RNA sequence: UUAGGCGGCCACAGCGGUGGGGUUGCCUCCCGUACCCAUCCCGAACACGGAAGAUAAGCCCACCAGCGUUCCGGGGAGUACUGGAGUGCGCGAGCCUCUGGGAAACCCGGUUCGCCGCCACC
RNA sequence: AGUGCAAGAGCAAAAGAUAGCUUGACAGUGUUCUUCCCAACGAGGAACGCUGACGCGAAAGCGUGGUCUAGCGAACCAAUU
RNA sequence: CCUGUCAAACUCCAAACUUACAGACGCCGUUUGACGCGGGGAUUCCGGUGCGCGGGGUA
């Protein structure tokens, strides 16, 4: 920028998207990465491997294509994340993938977070992943209980129209249940 | 030389051009090589670990197994056979 | 001391003041002479060109310069002309003044390295080349044989 | 294809230069060899450039020298048309000569010594202290130039 | 276009740069939330050689906590103009600073894909005076 | 790829600037603190929950060369320097010829306002 | 800028700063380079492993003292485990 | 802005050249056994000069 001697960061460092110091440590395992990413409305989970010209995604799951299996609720929550993890995990298994390491990019290792939910799902799908059980949520919160009780303090639907008024952690079960047998793209 | 340490006279070979300055890309630090492969030896000024004695910068040896994550590369110093312990960060496939 | 001792450029460049101390001050008084208020807006421009690479001690520079400018007062103390000595004595020079034991000499002076064909002096005059004479006197006090060269001047 | 003739001795000549002459089958002053014009051979002759005389000879000249100084890989045998015919793929010296020049074969392939052991130049050469462009005899030569030399050393 | 271009108050820092405290107490009451210690850097003659060392406190107020404060702070100040930032900020007073900016600021304060706010989308001293002046008082 | 995620090369991608894009969908800004979690003080950030609003930031798309960078043409320059050779020149410093290589500065004109890979997706 | 100290080199979501926690400055045993280019030669040094036991981290992982190159000492004898 | 100069312990640049490995040609080796391995015996560790590049020194 300023002169010949100026040092310009690697592109993905300028874009503040990739932490290369963490990337390296991640690639050390030699295992596929379980890329856990979030969006204001959605949650994505990808199983990425290393390649000659860039990463190769062997399997992935987006919270949006969750409705494709009967999801009728918001997609930016805990139950959403878990299921996306499980969906991606299953597709992963189908692809011959057996193990992976949790890459949470620039997100924080907060206990009970969604990235960990994604991790819990991927593990349940059958994926062997280095983890720590007490940094994960307590199942109920994964089910979406924290939100149902939150709607108990109603007076006004937590969901603008959407589905239900008192919400449904049950809808969560029905879906998980579904994913655990047969069905297309799995 | 006025001294005889490993870094004697290594001011040029172990210094980066201002633009290549800073942490190196991890892609080449994880590269995998197979026994028999020819690799060029060259220390990456930015990468502290997995180095070899600077005298060998510029050698092209033959990977022959590994130790830990580092590779064991066979070279010939002058007329003498030597085995160098080096990490991918400092190696490149020949050709 | 004779120029014989330092006129050759056979030694390494020795100018790093960060590693050399006790360097004698230069005897060269000024580098810009005449009407330095004005810029080279003159008809004629003569130059003194060195014909061999040599080292010129600040001693000879000052003598060469004075002898020329001091003479350029054939035009007057405030005459219309500007005189420039473009070189500066960067090369530090030593002397081993024990015999050949620990002989790295001590700083005794400075010199300017001039390559054959460079111009050491440049004057600017109106068709009034008294400067051509100021130079016959200047290359008289420097080691090399020299070429007095006139550039802008087809007024022959 | 160029004709190589060593005109300067081994004494004091660089060793890597000497080994080059030797790889081109010349081991004595006045010995001549015929070398294809390739990138590899070109580098070698440039290195030897200062102790040799080279250039492309004419069909005739090559034939005169081949007849006069060619030899079997072993023995005294004269390499005349009959020899050439009874021992090589060609039917006569001219046939061989043409093949050499067109770099289709080599003196070895035809069971001949790679070296044409010439005779000193009758009338003397132009000196071994200056190149051709300076009146000397070293370096690249004209086809007419090489011919003169080769013929004087026939 | 507007609505997402109109100024807003982001944090009001009330700090008391003492030289060695008991002062926090008043800051807590003048604002409504705990104060924060102010360590100092460098060793200096004002018998302030201690690197890590309490030498004052500050309080960053956001949202209502910042308005409900300025709804009495501003009135206790007169100044305006020149005393304003090139980014549309201004400090008066015990110090009371007011950081002002427009709707898409989080883009430069978040962790992921953070980015520096374009000069055009920045807040100018003038565009700032307007917003505030247009809120219970007068400029210069 | 009508806006996404992970990357490779790591400025040809930087700096600065102009124009365009969101009617359901995307990324955002955005709205909001019962929860998991959080600020040595602040739901600013981090984390969680969510759509009333917006395309003004970001982002994506199209483009501008003033600065920085990459490569190329022409000039500088076959100059500077240089591997090999010489009973060539020079008091000498040094130079010259032959042979094999061959620059930097700078000027003028082009190029460059990233390219490519995997996945996902009216 | 800073990173204990020469000089040169390395480093920015860090190798720097702040905070917290921790004792891997751990035991055992090697591979290799260096010391000594090439090319034999000890002490010492370093790089990289393994076995065992641990620390921290969600985890990949990092920790074989200090970012790298100086800070070192045979046999005999003594004391110590 | 304009204008005058430098660097063994400066470098936005940058050769010739030296050098690791590989292929090709050459030359060489497979009765002259190369490359290499093991063993016996040395001598040697005052060197000098020319040319190129040097560092010191008035030389
Ligand atoms: Cl994310
Ligand atoms: Cl080594
Ligand atoms: Mg050097
Ligand atoms: Mg014979
Ligand atoms: Mg006669
Ligand atoms: Mg003669
Ligand atoms: Mg717009
Ligand atoms: Mg270390
Ligand atoms: Mg004793
Ligand atoms: Mg004791
Ligand atoms: Mg060399
Ligand atoms: Na680097
Ligand atoms: Na003495
Ligand atoms: Na003279
Ligand atoms: Na404190
Ligand atoms: Na926008
Ligand atoms: Na040792």
From Swiss-Prot, chain A:
GO terms for biological process: ribosomal large subunit assembly; translation. Keywords: Ribonucleoprotein, Ribosomal protein, RNA-binding, rRNA-binding. The keyword Cytoplasm does not apply. This is one of 5 proteins that mediate the attachment of the 5S rRNA onto the large ribosomal subunit, where it forms part of the central protuberance and stabilizes the orientation of adjacent RNA domains. Belongs to the universal ribosomal protein uL18 family. Part of the 50S ribosomal subunit. Interacts with proteins L5 and L21e, and attaches the 5S rRNA to the 23S rRNA. Has been cross-linked to L21e. This is Large ribosomal subunit protein uL18. It comes from Haloarcula marismortui (strain ATCC 43049 / DSM 3752 / JCM 8966 / VKM B-1809). The lineage of its organism: Archaea, Methanobacteriati, Methanobacteriota, Stenosarchaea group, Halobacteria.
Curated annotation (Swiss-Prot), chain B:
InterPro entries: Ribosomal_eL21, Ribosomal_eL21_arc, Ribosomal_eL21_CS, Ribosomal_eL21_sf, Translation_prot_SH3-like_sf. It comes from the Archaea. Keywords: Ribonucleoprotein, Ribosomal protein, RNA-binding, rRNA-binding. GO terms for cellular component: ribonucleoprotein complex; ribosome. This is Large ribosomal subunit protein eL21. Coiled coil: none annotated. HAMAP family: Ribosomal_eL21. NCBIfam families: PRK04306.1.
From Swiss-Prot, chain D:
Keywords: Ribonucleoprotein, Ribosomal protein, RNA-binding, rRNA-binding. It comes from Haloarcula marismortui (strain ATCC 43049 / DSM 3752 / JCM 8966 / VKM B-1809) (Halobacterium marismortui). One of its GO terms (biological process) is maturation of LSU-rRNA from tricistronic rRNA transcript (SSU-rRNA, 5.8S rRNA, LSU-rRNA). The gene is rpl30. Residues 114-146 are annotated as: Disordered. One of its GO terms (molecular function) is structural constituent of ribosome. InterPro entries: Ribo_uL30_ferredoxin-like_sf (IPR036919), Ribosomal_uL30 (IPR039699), Ribosomal_uL30_arc (IPR005997), Ribosomal_uL30_CS (IPR018038), Ribosomal_uL30_euk_arc (IPR035808), Ribosomal_uL30_ferredoxin-like (IPR016082). This is Large ribosomal subunit protein uL30. This is one of 5 proteins that mediate the attachment of the 5S rRNA onto the large ribosomal subunit, stabilizing the orientation of adjacent RNA domains. One of its GO terms (cellular component) is cytosolic large ribosomal subunit. PANTHER family: 60S RIBOSOMAL PROTEIN L7, LARGE RIBOSOMAL SUBUNIT PROTEIN UL30. Part of the 50S ribosomal subunit. Binds 5S rRNA. Residues 123-144 have a biased composition (Basic and acidic residues). Belongs to the universal ribosomal protein uL30 family.
From Swiss-Prot, chain E:
The keyword tRNA-binding applies. GO terms for molecular function: rRNA binding; structural constituent of ribosome; tRNA binding. It comes from the Archaea. The keyword rRNA-binding applies. One of its GO terms (biological process) is translation. Keywords: Ribonucleoprotein, Ribosomal protein, RNA-binding, rRNA-binding, tRNA-binding. Transmembrane segments: none annotated. InterPro entries: Ribosomal_uL5 (IPR002132), Ribosomal_uL5_arc (IPR022804), Ribosomal_uL5_C (IPR031309), Ribosomal_uL5_CS (IPR020929), Ribosomal_uL5_dom_sf (IPR022803), Ribosomal_uL5_N (IPR031310). Pfam families: Ribosomal_L5 (PF00281), Ribosomal_L5_C (PF00673). GO terms for cellular component: ribonucleoprotein complex; ribosome. This is 1 of 5 proteins that mediates the attachment of the 5S rRNA onto the large ribosomal subunit, stabilizing the orientation of adjacent RNA domains. Forms part of the central protuberance. Modeling places the A and P site tRNAs in close proximity to this protein; the 5S rRNA and some of its associated proteins might help stabilize positioning of ribosome-bound tRNAs. In the 70S ribosome it is thought to contact protein S13 of the 30S subunit (bridge B1b), connecting the 2 subunits; this bridge is implicated in subunit movement. NCBIfam families: PRK04219.1. PANTHER family: 60S RIBOSOMAL PROTEIN L11-RELATED. Part of the 50S ribosomal subunit. Interacts with protein L18 and the 5S rRNA, and probably with tRNAs. Forms a bridge to the 30S subunit in the 70S ribosome. Belongs to the universal ribosomal protein uL5 family. The gene is rpl5.
């Amino acid at each position: 920028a300023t002169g010949p001697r100026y040092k310009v960061p690697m592109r993905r460092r300028r874009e503040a998207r990739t932490d290369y110091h963490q990337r390296l440590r991640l690639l050390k395992s030699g295992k596929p990465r379980l890329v856990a990413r979030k969006s204001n409305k959605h949650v994505r989970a990808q199983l990425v491997t290393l390649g000659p010209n860039g990463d190769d995604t062997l399997a992935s799951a987006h919270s949006s294509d969750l409705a494709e299996y009967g999801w009728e609720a918001p997609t930016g929550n805990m139950p959403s994340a878990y299921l996306t993890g499980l969906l991606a995990g299953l597709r992963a298994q189908e692809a011959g993938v057996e193990e992976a390491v949790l890459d949470i990019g620039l997100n924080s290792p907060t206990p009970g977070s969604k990235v960990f939910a994604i991790q819990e799902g991927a593990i349940d799908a059958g994926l062997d992943i280095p983890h720590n059980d007490d940094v994960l949520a307590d199942w109920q919160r994964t089910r979406g209980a924290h939100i149902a009780e939150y709607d108990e303090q109603l007076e006004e639907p937590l969901y603008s129209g959407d589905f239900d008024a008192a919400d449904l952690p049950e809808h969560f079960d029905e879906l998980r249940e579904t994913l655990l047998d047969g069905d297309i793209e799995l | 030389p006025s001294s005889n340490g490993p870094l004697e006279g290594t001011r040029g070979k172990l210094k980066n051009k201002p633009r290549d300055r800073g942490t190196s890309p991890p892609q080449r630090a994880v590269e995998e090589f197979d026994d028999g492969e020819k690799v060029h030896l060259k220390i990456d000024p930015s990468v502290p670990n997995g180095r070899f004695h600077p005298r060998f910068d510029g050698q092209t040896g033959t990977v022959e197994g590994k130790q830990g994550d580092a590779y064991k590369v066979d070279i010939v110093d002058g007329g003498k056979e030597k085995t160098i312990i080096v990490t991918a960060a400092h190696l490149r496939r020949q050709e | 001391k004779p120029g014989a001792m330092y006129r050759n450029s056979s030694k390494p460049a020795y100018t790093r003041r960060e590693y050399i101390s006790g360097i004698p001050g230069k005897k060269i008084a000024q580098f810009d002479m005449g009407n330095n208020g004005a810029g080279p807006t003159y008809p004629a421009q003569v130059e003194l060109v060195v014909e061999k690479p040599v080292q010129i001690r600040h001693n000879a520079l000052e003598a060469a310069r004075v002898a020329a400018n001091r003479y350029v007062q054939n035009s007057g103390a405030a005459a219309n002309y500007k005189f420039r000595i473009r070189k500066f004595p960067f090369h530090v020079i030593r002397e081993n003044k024990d015999g050949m034991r620990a002989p790295f000499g001590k700083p005794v002076g400075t010199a300017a390295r001039v390559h054959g064909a460079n111009h050491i002096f440049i004057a600017w005059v109106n068709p009034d080349p008294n400067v051509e004479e100021a130079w016959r006197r200047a290359k008289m006090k420097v080691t090399p044989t020299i070429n007095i060269d006139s550039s802008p001047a087809g007024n022959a | 294809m160029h004709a190589l003739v060593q005109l300067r001795g081994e004494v004091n000549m660089h060793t890597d230069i000497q080994d080059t002459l030797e790889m081109l089958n010349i081991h004595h002053v006045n010995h001549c060899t015929l070398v294809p014009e390739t990138d590899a051979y070109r580098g070698m002759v440039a290195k030897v450039n200062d102790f040799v005389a080279f250039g492309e000879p004419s069909q005739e000249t090559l034939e005169t020298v081949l007849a006069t100084r060619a030899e079997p890989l072993e023995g005294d045998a004269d390499v005349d048309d009959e020899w050439v015919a009874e021992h090589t793929d060609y039917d006569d010296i001219s046939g061989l000569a043409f093949a050499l020049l067109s770099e289709e074969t080599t003196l070895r392939e035809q069971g001949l010594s790679p070296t044409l052991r010439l005779h000193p130049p009758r009338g003397g050469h132009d000196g071994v202290k200056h190149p051709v462009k300076e009146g000397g005899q070293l370096g690249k030569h004209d086809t007419e130039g090489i011919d003169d030399l080769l013929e004087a050393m026939r | 276009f507007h609505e997402m271009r109109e100024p807003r108050i982001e944090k009001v820092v009330v700090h008391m740069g003492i030289g060695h405290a008991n002062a926090e107490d008043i800051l807590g009451e003048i604002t409504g939330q705990m104060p924060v210690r102010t360590k100092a850097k460098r060793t200096v003659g004002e018998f302030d050689i201690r690197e890590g060392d309490p030498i004052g406190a500050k309080v960053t107020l956001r949202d209502e906590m910042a308005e409900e404060f300025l709804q009495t702070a501003l009135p206790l100040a007169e100044l305006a103009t020149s005393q304003f930032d090139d980014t549309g900020n201004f400090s008066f007073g015990l110090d009371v600073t007011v950081n002002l900016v427009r709707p898409g600021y989080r883009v430069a304060k978040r962790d992921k894909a953070s980015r520096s706010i374009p000069t055009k989308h920045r807040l100018n001293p003038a565009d700032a005076v307007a917003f505030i002046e247009s809120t219970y008082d007068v400029e210069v």
